[PDB]
Design a protein around this ligand. Structure first.
Ligand SMILES: *[C@@H]1O[C@H](CO)[C@@H](O)[C@H](O)[C@H]1NC(C)=O
Ligand SMILES: *[C@@H]1O[C@H](CO)[C@@H](O)[C@H](O)[C@H]1NC(C)=O
Lengths: 99, 49
């Protein structure tokens, strides 16, 4: 409700905590191109080259995915440049950080 | 455990992973080798080879 004169103001508060999951890195597999496409066979190296070096545009990018995986976990957690440590005595004016 | 009335074996992908001799009955599994792809880590050509 409201009219030319009204307003609502809180009287008490309540601190709250909520999680927010976020993927950062994904286990990167290193799959090659020949074996998979073709194992150890005499005609493996002759018929494979009939198409060209398409494996160049196949395995080149897969490594890039792998490298970018750790660059994601480097900029996320390695923000601070010095590694700190909490004081031996846990006295923070009443707050409990044991969890 | 191979029941002694089957003939072949194929896990998946038509992979005939069961080869048996007429005289002796033995089971086996077939998988492609380890294998690996390669990539070259080269600094500047003008710097070093
Ligand atoms: C805290 O909130 C309650 C109602 O939930 C209220 O009665 C109380 O006054 C608030 N705290 C203070 C210090 O007023
Ligand atoms: C590489 O080294 C040569 C020296 O022969 C130089 O002329 C050239 O500018 C260099 N290129 C780069 C990209 O540093």
């Amino acid at each position: 409700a409201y009219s030319n004169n009204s307003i609502a103001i809180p009287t008490n508060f309540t601190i709250s905590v909520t999680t927010e999951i976020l993927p950062v890195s994904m286990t990167k597999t290193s799959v090659d191109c020949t074996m998979y496409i073709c194992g150890d066979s005499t005609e493996c190296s002759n018929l494979l080259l009939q198409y060209g070096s398409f494996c160049t545009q196949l395995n080149r990018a897969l490594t890039g995915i792998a490298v970018e995986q750790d660059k994601n976990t480097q900029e996320v957690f390695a923000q601070v440049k010095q590694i700190y440590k909490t004081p031996p005595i846990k006295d923070f004016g009443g707050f409990n950080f044991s969890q | 455990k191979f029941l002694p009335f089957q003939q072949f074996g194929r896990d998946i992908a038509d992979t005939t992973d069961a080869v048996r001799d007429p005289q002796t009955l033995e089971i086996l599994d077939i998988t492609p080798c380890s294998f690996g792809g390669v990539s070259v880590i080269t600094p500047g050509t003008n710097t070093s080879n």
